[PDB]
Amino acid sequence: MHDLKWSAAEKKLAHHVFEAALTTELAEIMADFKARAAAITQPQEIWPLQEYLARKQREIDRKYDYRYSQLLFVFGQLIREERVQEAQLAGLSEEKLGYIRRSASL
Template identity: 60%
Template sequence: MHDIKWSPSEKKVARRAYEAALAVALAKILAEFKAKAAQVATPSEMWDLEEYLRRKRKHIDTLFDYRYSQLTFVFAAAIREGYLDESSLAGLPEEKLEPIRRLLRWAEG
């Protein structure tokens, strides 16, 4: 999976899907943050919220790795976490989609 070559058109599809998934992930975290922030009533809860954001940022930074060698894993994880639908990858050839599907099946199993 690490030596897969990406054509210019595949790179465009991948970039659009990546950006869309990242936007969904960030919007979800922002909504959760706002809801949690509205409930903060003590300094301790405020620091808990900071820790929540730190964990979420680390997760996003780890998940959304835009190296072509990692996109198979990124897309599989984004689909699994509900940030991306496989239809967003339309335009990628089967040789790119099958490893993503394999990872999804493996994660379910």
């Protein structure tokens, strides 16, 4: 809940970085899911798979919050996870980058 003004260039650059990170992570999840599915030998084993999928959807939902008021926190958190690099967001304002860096400290 950072109420700053975003330029068109800022929303464009943010969209590119958000998408790149989300795409990479979802690819990872899809590969893991498929692996787990293939490894199933007994019907009851579908249960733990559903537990995984639920946890992953919730995780993604919370982490990839595409609301501008939240994007500085999101980016910081992705930088902390090493899914985004600060260089990718250099076009954003210095104010924004400061907030992102602080968010990468939580």
